[PDB]
Amino acid sequence: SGALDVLQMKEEDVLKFLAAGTHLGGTNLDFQMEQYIYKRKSDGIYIINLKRTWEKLLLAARAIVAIENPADVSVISSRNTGQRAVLKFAAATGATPIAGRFTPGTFTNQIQTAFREPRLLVVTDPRADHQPLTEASYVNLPTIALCNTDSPLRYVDIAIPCNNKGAHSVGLMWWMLAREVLRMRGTISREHPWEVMPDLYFYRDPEEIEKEEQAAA
Amino acid sequence: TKKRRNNGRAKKGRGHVQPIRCTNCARCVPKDKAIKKFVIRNIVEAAAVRDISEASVFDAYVLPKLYVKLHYCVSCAIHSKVVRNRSREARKDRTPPPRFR
Amino acid sequence: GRVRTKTVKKAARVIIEKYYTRLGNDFHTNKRVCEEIAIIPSKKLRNKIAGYVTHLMKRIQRGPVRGISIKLQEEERERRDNYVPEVSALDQEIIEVDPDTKEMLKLLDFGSLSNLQVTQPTVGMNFKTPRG
Amino acid sequence: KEWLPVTKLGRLVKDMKIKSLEEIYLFSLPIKESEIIDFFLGASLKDEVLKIMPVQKQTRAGQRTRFKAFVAIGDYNGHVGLGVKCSKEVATAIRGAIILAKLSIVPVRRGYWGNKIGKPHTVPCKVTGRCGSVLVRLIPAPRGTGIVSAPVPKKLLMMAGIDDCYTSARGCTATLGNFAKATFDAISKTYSYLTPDLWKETVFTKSPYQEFTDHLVKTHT
Amino acid sequence: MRAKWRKKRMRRLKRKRRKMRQRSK
Amino acid sequence: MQNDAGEFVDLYVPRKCSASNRIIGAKDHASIQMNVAEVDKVTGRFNGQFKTYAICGAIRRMGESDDSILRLAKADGIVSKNF
Amino acid sequence: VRMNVLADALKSINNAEKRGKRQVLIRPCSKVIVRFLTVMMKHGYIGEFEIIDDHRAGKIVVNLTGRLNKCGVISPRFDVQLKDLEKWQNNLLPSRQFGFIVLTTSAGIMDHEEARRKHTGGKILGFFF
RNA sequence: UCAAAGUUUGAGCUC
RNA sequence: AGACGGACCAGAGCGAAAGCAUUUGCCAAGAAUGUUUUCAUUAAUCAAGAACGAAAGUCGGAGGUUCGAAGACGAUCAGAUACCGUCGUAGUUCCGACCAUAAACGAUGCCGACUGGCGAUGCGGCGGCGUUAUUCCCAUGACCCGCCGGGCAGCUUCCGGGAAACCAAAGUCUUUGGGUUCCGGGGGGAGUAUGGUUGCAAAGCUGAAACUUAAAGGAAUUGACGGAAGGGCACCACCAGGA
Ligand SMILES: [Mg+2]
Ligand SMILES: [Mg+2]
Ligand SMILES: [Mg+2]
Ligand SMILES: [Mg+2]
Ligand SMILES: [Mg+2]
Ligand SMILES: [Mg+2]
Ligand SMILES: [Mg+2]
Ligand SMILES: [Mg+2]
Ligand SMILES: [Mg+2]
Ligand SMILES: [Mg+2]
Ligand SMILES: [Mg+2]
Ligand SMILES: [Mg+2]
Ligand SMILES: [Mg+2]
Ligand SMILES: [Mg+2]
Ligand SMILES: [Mg+2]
Ligand SMILES: [Mg+2]
Ligand SMILES: [Mg+2]
Ligand SMILES: [Zn+2]
């Protein structure tokens, strides 16, 4: 990942980042998230440096590969924004999903029915998933999490800087993670592009849903 | 035990303020502790103006207003039921509600 | 008042959730279904079960319910997600970019790009939310 | 009788591979199942009911008396546990207390006073501990002095096997629960105390999940 | 007796003790 | 730990966080073992060797752990010195 | 007014070491302090500090390691006979095996064990372990 | 848009 | 004629503290800021000693509008020498003389250092597209976006502490010592007595003992009660009525 042009970012991907508005952070700024910021605009939005976003991504590749048995990855999102994403990722990687309503005390209460004991976690948003974090103290769990400038860095061990607010940049970051996990092991060649489209990972609004069913009919 | 942080008043840098005579009582309350209400209001409110509007000569001639500023004492306020009791936790929520009422 | 007990309700959700197809809206028919498939000792229990099972079948026939994972819904989600448009929204002929991302890329290696446009500055400083 | 285990830790232990619970303390893994400890040390282990204490909250119907059990457990080398349970009747209350203690057993670090020849007998340094009001300082003592302390601290530190130790106390020892929690923190922070011994960098051995990932998955889902 | 009267009553008392001692002088 | 004769007496030498130099306890359930995959530089595939970094729980719950890690990588040449 | 420079500095470092801070700036540079650091350094408890000379009371930057539980001070500077040295080092330290009491002497700045070798009593400055 | 509202065998409660 | 200077009036400012708000003029001062201004240790805290110190009270004048201790009477009420009312004295106002007491509360002594944020604000200072008046530019004024010092406050978190209530201080404590004053050691008896001192008086200050007594208190939990509020029900409640 370091000092290696092979795994480095591409001109298409750079255009993808900017199109989502990944560089485009939030309005408020935590004093811990300074390292990731480039500069301020007029209109007051901080621009995230996408190469270092890239670097954190390659660190994700290293970590996911290091987890040898892929079943024991867990991938959570309560809100709908990352709901299709965690599913598509579990589909490709062979992981165990948690789709909405993370039942509290799942990791601690043994007798409770859904007692899963994974070795790694991937959250989409800390505030909405505070309950996993409080369990993630009681159990020895490492954690990846998509975090904005506002996001607080309690108990998070590897935050990934993106525009986790936007729909596109979010689904996109999940697509790139699934790619890199596959490319870093002996599966895919870098010559071809991956067939799957990032809009496959996307979230569709019910109005767009009625628009599709209406266009079908 | 300390019931409230500000002692039901706003005396942090100052030290003394002028007392006021209650309207319903005459109870002496420190102006800074005392409740302050700026009530401007139509000499005719809503039901009356519809009735009184019949009594006006000119079609749609504007009424002047009644620019009050009231101060009440505490025991009168709860009796007149302007303010309700709140819980220990809700007490810190010192934001007033929006402008629905 | 004719209100359903938890033994009534749980039984109706189990009946519609396990055999949505067998069930229907009318009580007296889907009653025959309920008495056949399920051995309800009392006729009152049978009939109540059937009447809440019926009205609930109409609820589902009217539409999809929130707090329940229907297998049919799982299939439609797989279908909807496989729905793909002709082209991705990310593929664009021209991408707008701010002067800071222009200056930062020009200092970085990625100086010249074909489909970029360093757009105008947002004039008129009114971004802060009013105080009070 | 037969403990058919569910957990990951439980199944690796059950297959008789992981030789000691020190290997688990090395990795800070939560010891939820009691049958592991009954597997390893069940023979030498010894219990002591410290006291029966009747709390009672008032009701319209008199007050509901319900007893609160304190239970010391422990083999005389290294390991000790502390179970506390409140219940309406003693058999279930004591059993569940005993399980909770067994769950919570911890090791004690022991060193040498003065001259290093021989085996470690006393406490290393002046350790303290507290809970609520009560504070209890443990002190190093030379060999053969005995445990200079109250019946109670004396009684536990024996169970852990700490022959010589001076003690100092302060506050309302009458809160017994607090006295036990504080002397328990004292003897816990003994293995959390940073001696120059440990300046030597740690060798990171392989985690038992890494070694045995295919076993638990093959044995169960 | 509230401290209001303890303090005030002791004041009425002190007046009585001073007079009684004066007549003896 | 040993006396003049040289005997290791303690039954188990505990782990010590690599970031703070603080000995991680027997009941630190916020503790960790991050195993980092090693890469075949040209190929981009797993070699076999890992790169473990252990962290105390405390600095985690304070929140400066991810910066600490970024420092470890960039110090050990994992992250660009250019960055 | 500021009386004890050393007394402020050593608190500042203990409130750093509790927070695991990595390097520390201390604002008044004294010669006694400097001797003190060099004593702990030769014996390996900390790394290589560096001192910022201004034609003034200097500053000092300590790159801190993590082996220091506490580094304390004794004000007032008590005289210490060889009779009292054992009672001091008993009551003032964790154990008979480790930990040190550093006292400056006519002979020079040195540990108490070195004072035991050299047969030299003196004025207690402070301690660390 | 505030007039008021007092007591209760000595003859046995309780972990 | 004498009080009073509303509304503008803020979780704002200044003052050693009580406290300080109608216009204009005179007198001097000061915290804070900028400073490559002078001297070069001149400093911090303090028994003894001293200045100031709301209201009531007191002594003289001056003034006596309102209110209003005391007091009277009229009302309710078993009683009310009170709460309600009509009158109404001293006092309430100014000048000149005493006095030194309040929950005089942040119930938190003064200096000095260190360890998290976040937005807002007041002052002085600095920098920076553009709007907007001076209009015709400059350089000022009002906005606007920032940085700096200390300042009244606010929010915030497993920093850690603390019996808890809570505190970025009530932290840096059995890992106990940066400097220095004052002051407490079971409840009552009692801030009484006796002595001393001050004051016209009121009273202030210093300040004991006998004897009696096994408990007095704090925070927080669950009840029970509430002539405190919010929800909901009932013809042994009401409502509508009936024997
Ligand atoms: Mg009454
Ligand atoms: Mg009687
Ligand atoms: Mg006026
Ligand atoms: Mg005052
Ligand atoms: Mg004095
Ligand atoms: Mg006066
Ligand atoms: Mg006066
Ligand atoms: Mg007079
Ligand atoms: Mg009157
Ligand atoms: Mg009368
Ligand atoms: Mg009257
Ligand atoms: Mg006072
Ligand atoms: Mg002390
Ligand atoms: Mg006493
Ligand atoms: Mg008695
Ligand atoms: Mg009745
Ligand atoms: Mg009715
Ligand atoms: Zn009132």
Numbering used by the authors:
A (entry chain AA): 2 to 218
B (entry chain aa): 2 to 102
C (entry chain RR): 2 to 133
D (entry chain CC): 58 to 278
E (entry chain n): 1 to 25
F (entry chain VV): 1 to 83
G (entry chain WW): 2 to 130
Describing publication, verbatim:
Blasticidin S (BlaS) targets translation by binding to the peptidyl transferase center of the large ribosomal subunit. BlaS is a peptidyl-nucleoside antibiotic composed of a cytosine, a pyranose sugar ring, and an N-methyl-guanidine tail. To understand BlaS’ impact on mammalian translation termination, we solved the cryo-EM structure of ribosomal complexes with BlaS, eRF1, and eRF3a in the presence of GTP. All three structures have BlaS bound in the 60S peptidyl transferase center.
In class 3, called ‘eRF-Bound’ (18,937 particles, 4.1 Å resolution), the P-site tRNA is present but poorly resolved, and therefore the P-site tRNA in this structure is not modelled. The A-site in the small subunit (the decoding center) is bound by eRF1, and eRF1 and eRF3a are in the pre-accommodation state. In the eRF-Bound termination complex, eRF1 is bound in the pre-accommodated state and complexed with eRF3a. The lower local resolution of the eRFs (4.5-6.0Å) and the flexibility of the P-site tRNA (only weak density for the 3′CCA tail and anticodon stem loop is detected) suggests that these factors are in a state of conformational sampling, likely a product of attempted accommodation of eRF1. However, density for eRF1 was found only in the decoding center of 40S in one of the structures. This eRF-bound structure, which presents ∼6% of the particles, is lower resolution (4.1 Å) compared to the other two structures, and the local resolution of eRF1 and eRF3a is even lower (ca 4.5–6.0 Å), suggestive of a degree of dynamic conformational sampling within the eRF1–eRF3a complex. In the Hybrid and eRF-Bound cryo-EM structures, BlaS density is observed in the P-site of the 60S subunit at the same position. However, small differences are found in the positioning of BlaS’ cytosine and N-methyl-guanidine tail resulting in a slightly altered hydrogen bonding network and clearer base stacking with both C75 and A76 of the 3′CCA tail. Therefore, the absence of eRF1 accommodation in our structures is likely explained by this comparatively large distortion of the 3′CCA tail of peptidyl-tRNA.
